[PDB]
Amino acid sequence: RTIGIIGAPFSKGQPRGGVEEGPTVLRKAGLLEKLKEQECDVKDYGDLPFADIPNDSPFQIVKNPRSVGKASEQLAGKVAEVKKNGRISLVLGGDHSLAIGSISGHARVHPDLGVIWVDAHTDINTPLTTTSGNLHGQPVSFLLKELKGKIPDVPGFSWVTPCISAKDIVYIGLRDVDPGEHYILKTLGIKYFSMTEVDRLGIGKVMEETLSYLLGRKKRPIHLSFDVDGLDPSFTPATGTPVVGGLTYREGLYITEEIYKTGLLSGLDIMEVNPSLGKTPEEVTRTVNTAVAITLACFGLAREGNHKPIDYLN
Amino acid sequence: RTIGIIGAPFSKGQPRGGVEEGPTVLRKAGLLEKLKEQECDVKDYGDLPFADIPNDSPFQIVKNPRSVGKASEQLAGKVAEVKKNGRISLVLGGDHSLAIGSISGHARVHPDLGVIWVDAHTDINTPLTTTSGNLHGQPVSFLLKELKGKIPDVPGFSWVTPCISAKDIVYIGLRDVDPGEHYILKTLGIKYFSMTEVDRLGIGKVMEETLSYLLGRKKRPIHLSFDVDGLDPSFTPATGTPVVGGLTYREGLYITEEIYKTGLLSGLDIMEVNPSLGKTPEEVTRTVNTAVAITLACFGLAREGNHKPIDYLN
Amino acid sequence: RTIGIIGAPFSKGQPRGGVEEGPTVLRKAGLLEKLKEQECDVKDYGDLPFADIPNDSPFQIVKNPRSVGKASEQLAGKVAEVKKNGRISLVLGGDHSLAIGSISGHARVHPDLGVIWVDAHTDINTPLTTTSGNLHGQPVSFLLKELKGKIPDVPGFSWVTPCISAKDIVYIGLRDVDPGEHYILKTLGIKYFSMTEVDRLGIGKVMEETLSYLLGRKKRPIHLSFDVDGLDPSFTPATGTPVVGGLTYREGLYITEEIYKTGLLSGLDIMEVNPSLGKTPEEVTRTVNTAVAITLACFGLAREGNHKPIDYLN
Ligand SMILES: NCCC[C@H](N)C(=O)O
Ligand SMILES: NCCC[C@H](N)C(=O)O
Ligand SMILES: NCCC[C@H](N)C(=O)O
Ligand SMILES: NCCC[C@H](N)C(=O)O
Ligand SMILES: NCCC[C@H](N)C(=O)O
Ligand SMILES: NCCC[C@H](N)C(=O)O
Ligand SMILES: [Co+2]
Ligand SMILES: [Co+2]
Ligand SMILES: [Co+2]
Ligand SMILES: [Co+2]
Ligand SMILES: [Co+2]
Ligand SMILES: [Co+2]
């Protein structure tokens, strides 16, 4: 698979700052080398230079709106560039607010994309339903066409144009959804598989339904926004908003192995890895290592094994 | 849902004493506040005052029979009171021997109840098949009509009257059943899903079958006796008789979320939480926190989220 | 069930030496006593005396070929002896290279046997596809009839005769398969259930398919080669080649409980337990205890309980 790597060292979508170190620790773990170790054509576009916006007072309750808005506007441009280069954009991120730019830029080149959002959260709060004011919990609200008219004019997001319909996204792993968020899910008829559904059906059926749901009518590019807190904190502890009872390491790899097999992966986000939040050096490496494994699975690494098209017995 | 909370600080059904602190640590974790935080009508009936019975020599091998018998007789009265008040009895317990009084009192108001027993143990030893002499491993034998005639006249239990038939109970999570207990299961035809069945069918099918088994003929009140050792000790370590390979945090919440959805939960027991047995301050909080989560799920807290009947988008 | 215990304190199939202590720590944990505690007829044949072969230079890249070859030749003889005694051979092993002798000796008495290989690895590298040179990752290549002609004349294995066809073996738990190994799987059409298949179908369906696959045409003796690294290192950490995302404790017991129920278990290998690799005294006991539990399940210990054919209520 051909990849376009984009480091997005950004954290202003939430309170803890160590998330901007995500691109660095993932590269350090040898993500490029390992990807290349597979039949992968890897091109690193480097880390986007997110300049500081010193003047960025809250918009009502919403924090760092201009900084978050600018980072996504800049990222949207980069992602559209890599997509125009015929490569799968791989955004090594900071916080999940960056999904606004990643999906936006991706949709500019492939308006028919479908989204799979692996997360413990729906991140669909609007600037008016949010209680935390953290934009990493509102990315989906800015992207949904059905919600346009419910999103106030927030400084820094005038460039945004809702690019996805409520029917073009599936959530997997939900276990901490706010009331307003749940109201939005039920009201717009958004397809989701919370941890309850995963327990009920098993990850196998969950994925069968997810892909059938998004690819049934017709094949379309797939955007996978993977928030590492979607997995249980026993696997990815170094993250800002962890929630117990998450998806297992195995389910995480299953999700990605299945998405890979579709041959339709078009965009990928590996978000919320925050080394600074690891209670120990080992929790940090455990989080980074799991984040790498998930990424590799998205690009072909299978647990049953892989082999080149040659005669190994000769 | 409307709840009637009853603290049962009792431990004489087994050897370790810290179990009588269960009501205290659960209240401390803010169980009342959290329940009220939901659309819950909560009334605390307080902690029952289990007076000491200084003279209580063993009945053969059975220990503290008068103390255990009295605690259940007193609890049976309280539970019947809260049930008569039109509320779901929530017994914050000490050891599982208290199930004798909780189910007995519940059955006085609702004789048609069905029981779901989540536990690593069947707790169905009779005073004659028990080898430990601990009454927390014999509660079910005193309640089963089919076993009346096999239970000797034990001091303190003359007030008991078997109130449930072998067909009105389902076990979930079994993994440490004594030989005599297993003989009773097979002989009376008791429905159970040991860890083997959960592994085979998945918790989803297990619950489908459980509810169909108990509610098929007709809807009836449900009594859920949840022993925290039913869950794996990785989740609830501070308990007296832990057994590895237990139900997961997720399966525990799935069990309860499904029971809640029936709208038939009538009685609930959260038992065997023993803070004094936590190897660390964290194992204690981990056990208490999991015990609280399970309780909240029984009363409506769903992992996919919850929302009031208002227009959140306005 | 009637058992013939054979200790195989061998480690030259891989680099770390503590694996030869496997028989000792398993016996110490009281494996004999516990087996006898069940309706088991247990006969200990003791630990085979694997004499040192001082002169054993590598064969190309392959290490300790004469030592490994001799240990398996000696073990093959013992296993055939216990099988001739009408007992299920239970090989308490060192490294997995010993599977060559165990399956070879077993097949001498029961040529129609079927093999279930529980492992994170396929251990099917040939002396020419191996990159590590460790023979514990090549046992299956020496046993497969279809691969005879692809295995060079390695010092110490002239006694070997491929005894199993590619169709008589099923793998369960795979998650670290080398490229050449994967090529062999696909080329010979070997049946396997990697962790991906377990996630997809659930261990219940995996076992249904496994047994149907091997016993469909006709009932035949079953050889279970259980590598403890097949289970997740959270359960069996003290092992030489651990791989995350393994089978759970529950799945491990499910696998074995199901095999037991067939009444066809004929040979068993409990391999790769290396006490010397436990980061703590507790990781060692955790590994040994899990290894014992798996063994007991193979011989009748069920999680739902067991009872003798008597009237426990009397
Ligand atoms: N920050 C205003 C409160 C909005 C609330 N989170 C809701 O949508 O229910
Ligand atoms: N990214 C996690 C979001 C957490 C919470 N729902 C919030 O809106 O802040
Ligand atoms: N304490 C008398 C022994 C009874 C034994 N637990 C049985 O029922 O098999
Ligand atoms: N409450 C756990 C019971 C443990 C054992 N079956 C006993 O009878 O003591
Ligand atoms: N040691 C020679 C390299 C063989 C390689 N492991 C392969 O079979 O692809
Ligand atoms: N026994 C584990 C084998 C590991 C690796 N495939 C090897 O051939 O050395
Ligand atoms: Co999240
Ligand atoms: Co998120
Ligand atoms: Co119990
Ligand atoms: Co119990
Ligand atoms: Co292995
Ligand atoms: Co192996």
XYZ file of N, CA, C and O in Angstrom, chain B residues 210-281:
288
model
N -30.778 -16.668 29.071
C -31.128 -16.498 30.475
C -32.505 -15.856 30.641
O -33.359 -16.378 31.348
N -32.711 -14.724 29.980
C -33.971 -13.995 30.082
C -35.135 -14.766 29.450
O -36.262 -14.731 29.948
N -34.860 -15.472 28.357
C -35.899 -16.248 27.697
C -36.286 -17.393 28.605
O -37.454 -17.751 28.705
N -35.282 -17.967 29.259
C -35.481 -19.083 30.177
C -36.366 -18.693 31.363
O -37.266 -19.440 31.752
N -36.108 -17.522 31.935
C -36.874 -17.051 33.084
C -38.151 -16.272 32.768
O -39.080 -16.266 33.573
N -38.206 -15.620 31.610
C -39.379 -14.816 31.256
C -40.232 -15.363 30.115
O -41.257 -14.780 29.770
N -39.805 -16.478 29.536
C -40.540 -17.070 28.433
C -42.020 -17.285 28.691
O -42.858 -16.700 28.004
N -42.342 -18.131 29.668
C -43.735 -18.423 30.010
C -44.504 -17.140 30.307
O -45.607 -16.931 29.797
N -43.920 -16.278 31.131
C -44.563 -15.020 31.477
C -43.582 -14.068 32.147
O -42.576 -14.495 32.721
N -43.873 -12.774 32.069
C -43.014 -11.791 32.712
C -43.218 -11.929 34.216
O -44.337 -12.168 34.679
N -42.125 -11.798 34.964
C -42.139 -11.918 36.421
C -41.019 -11.067 36.989
O -40.049 -10.772 36.289
N -41.133 -10.648 38.261
C -40.066 -9.823 38.840
C -38.729 -10.559 38.840
O -38.688 -11.775 39.015
N -37.640 -9.821 38.640
C -36.304 -10.409 38.620
C -35.472 -10.013 39.830
O -35.418 -8.839 40.205
N -34.835 -11.007 40.440
C -33.953 -10.779 41.573
C -32.545 -11.080 41.071
O -32.267 -12.184 40.601
N -31.663 -10.093 41.154
C -30.291 -10.279 40.711
C -29.373 -10.310 41.919
O -29.230 -9.306 42.623
N -28.764 -11.464 42.176
C -27.841 -11.564 43.294
C -26.464 -11.551 42.653
O -26.034 -12.542 42.066
N -25.785 -10.415 42.757
C -24.479 -10.268 42.146
C -23.349 -10.360 43.160
O -23.188 -9.491 44.027
N -22.581 -11.437 43.053
C -21.438 -11.652 43.919
C -20.291 -11.076 43.115
O -20.073 -11.474 41.968
N -19.552 -10.144 43.702
C -18.468 -9.529 42.966
C -17.349 -10.497 42.583
O -16.544 -10.182 41.712
N -17.293 -11.677 43.198
C -16.246 -12.616 42.815
C -16.643 -13.358 41.535
O -15.906 -14.211 41.034
N -17.813 -13.010 41.001
C -18.263 -13.607 39.753
C -17.374 -13.032 38.662
O -17.077 -13.695 37.663
N -16.944 -11.784 38.863
C -16.053 -11.113 37.916
C -14.618 -11.541 38.204
O -14.299 -11.980 39.310
N -13.753 -11.407 37.207
C -12.356 -11.795 37.363
C -11.685 -10.931 38.427
O -11.974 -9.743 38.533
N -10.789 -11.521 39.237
C -10.101 -10.755 40.280
C -9.211 -9.621 39.751
O -8.630 -8.858 40.527
N -9.103 -9.508 38.430
C -8.316 -8.424 37.841
C -9.173 -7.164 37.950
O -8.670 -6.041 37.864
N -10.473 -7.370 38.157
C -11.422 -6.273 38.292
C -11.904 -6.095 39.721
O -12.032 -4.969 40.200
N -12.164 -7.203 40.404
C -12.632 -7.163 41.788
C -11.746 -8.033 42.684
O -12.174 -9.085 43.168
N -10.496 -7.596 42.923
C -9.545 -8.336 43.760
C -9.859 -8.413 45.254
O -9.580 -9.428 45.902
N -10.418 -7.335 45.800
C -10.742 -7.279 47.225
C -12.025 -8.048 47.537
O -13.076 -7.462 47.801
N -11.925 -9.371 47.491
C -13.053 -10.250 47.762
C -12.457 -11.504 48.409
O -11.308 -11.852 48.138
N -13.231 -12.162 49.268
C -12.748 -13.328 49.998
C -12.452 -14.640 49.292
O -11.530 -15.357 49.678
N -13.239 -14.975 48.276
C -13.036 -16.219 47.544
C -12.890 -15.940 46.054
O -13.776 -16.265 45.261
N -11.765 -15.323 45.654
C -11.542 -15.015 44.239
C -11.148 -16.251 43.437
O -10.537 -17.178 43.971
N -11.521 -16.260 42.157
C -11.192 -17.361 41.256
C -10.841 -16.764 39.890
O -11.624 -16.014 39.316
N -9.653 -17.090 39.385
C -9.186 -16.585 38.095
C -10.080 -17.041 36.947
O -10.868 -17.978 37.099
N -9.945 -16.373 35.800
C -10.739 -16.700 34.629
C -12.197 -16.313 34.775
O -13.092 -17.006 34.290
N -12.444 -15.187 35.429
C -13.814 -14.761 35.634
C -14.404 -13.920 34.519
O -13.792 -13.709 33.474
N -15.621 -13.453 34.748
C -16.307 -12.611 33.790
C -15.537 -11.292 33.735
O -14.969 -10.846 34.740
N -15.510 -10.673 32.558
C -14.812 -9.407 32.397
C -15.687 -8.239 32.848
O -16.893 -8.390 33.063
N -15.061 -7.076 32.982
C -15.737 -5.848 33.370
C -16.890 -5.644 32.374
O -18.038 -5.421 32.763
N -16.568 -5.745 31.084
C -17.540 -5.579 30.002
C -18.716 -6.542 30.102
O -19.869 -6.123 29.984
N -18.429 -7.826 30.320
C -19.484 -8.832 30.448
C -20.354 -8.511 31.660
O -21.570 -8.689 31.619
N -19.724 -8.032 32.732
C -20.465 -7.668 33.930
C -21.471 -6.567 33.642
O -22.629 -6.636 34.072
N -21.029 -5.542 32.912
C -21.890 -4.423 32.544
C -22.923 -4.858 31.520
O -24.030 -4.328 31.489
N -22.560 -5.819 30.678
C -23.490 -6.293 29.662
C -24.644 -7.017 30.348
O -25.817 -6.802 30.027
N -24.298 -7.883 31.296
C -25.280 -8.639 32.063
C -26.322 -7.689 32.643
O -27.522 -7.851 32.431
N -25.834 -6.695 33.379
C -26.685 -5.722 34.036
C -27.440 -4.776 33.105
O -28.588 -4.431 33.378
N -26.808 -4.351 32.015
C -27.468 -3.462 31.064
C -28.673 -4.185 30.484
O -29.737 -3.597 30.309
N -28.501 -5.470 30.198
C -29.579 -6.281 29.644
C -30.699 -6.505 30.654
O -31.874 -6.466 30.297
N -30.338 -6.750 31.908
C -31.340 -6.956 32.947
C -32.137 -5.662 33.118
O -33.366 -5.679 33.250
N -31.435 -4.535 33.104
C -32.109 -3.256 33.243
C -33.151 -3.069 32.149
O -34.290 -2.696 32.422
N -32.740 -3.316 30.908
C -33.608 -3.156 29.748
C -34.898 -3.970 29.811
O -35.850 -3.676 29.089
N -34.938 -4.985 30.666
C -36.140 -5.803 30.791
C -37.231 -4.997 31.490
O -38.423 -5.217 31.266
N -36.807 -4.063 32.335
C -37.752 -3.257 33.083
C -38.334 -4.082 34.216
O -39.244 -3.641 34.918
N -37.788 -5.282 34.403
C -38.269 -6.185 35.447
C -37.376 -6.353 36.679
O -37.712 -7.140 37.571
N -36.256 -5.631 36.748
C -35.401 -5.738 37.928
C -36.260 -5.381 39.145
O -36.889 -4.320 39.186
N -36.280 -6.276 40.130
C -37.095 -6.095 41.322
C -36.265 -6.104 42.607
O -36.602 -5.430 43.581
N -35.185 -6.875 42.607
C -34.317 -6.954 43.767
C -32.873 -7.086 43.318
O -32.582 -7.733 42.309
N -31.957 -6.477 44.060
C -30.547 -6.545 43.699
C -29.643 -6.702 44.921
O -29.873 -6.083 45.964
N -28.632 -7.556 44.780
C -27.651 -7.785 45.837
C -26.267 -7.509 45.257
O -25.920 -8.064 44.227
N -25.487 -6.652 45.904
C -24.121 -6.383 45.459
C -23.335 -6.907 46.654
O -23.219 -6.224 47.672
N -22.799 -8.123 46.524
C -22.127 -8.796 47.636
C -20.659 -9.158 47.537
O -20.072 -9.202 46.455
N -20.101 -9.449 48.710
C -18.717 -9.884 48.881
C -17.581 -8.894 48.622
O -16.437 -9.303 48.399
N -17.883 -7.599 48.641
C -16.831 -6.601 48.472
C -16.153 -6.494 49.854
O -16.802 -6.130 50.836
N -14.867 -6.845 49.933
C -14.126 -6.785 51.198
C -12.867 -5.920 51.063
O -11.786 -6.417 50.738
N -12.991 -4.613 51.340
C -11.856 -3.690 51.237
C -10.578 -4.172 51.937
O -9.475 -3.986 51.417
N -10.736 -4.795 53.105
C -9.604 -5.280 53.898
C -8.734 -6.310 53.192
O -7.634 -6.602 53.647
N -9.221 -6.858 52.083
C -8.466 -7.869 51.352
C -7.738 -7.346 50.116
O -7.178 -8.126 49.340
N -7.742 -6.031 49.926
C -7.046 -5.468 48.784
C -5.558 -5.414 49.082
O -5.143 -4.859 50.102
N -4.746 -5.997 48.206
C -3.296 -6.003 48.399
C -2.734 -4.584 48.369
O -1.619 -4.341 48.827
N -3.510 -3.653 47.821
C -3.096 -2.258 47.722
C -4.302 -1.324 47.769
O -5.444 -1.756 47.581
N -4.064 -0.027 48.023
C -5.159 0.943 48.079
C -5.885 0.980 46.737
O -7.083 1.248 46.667
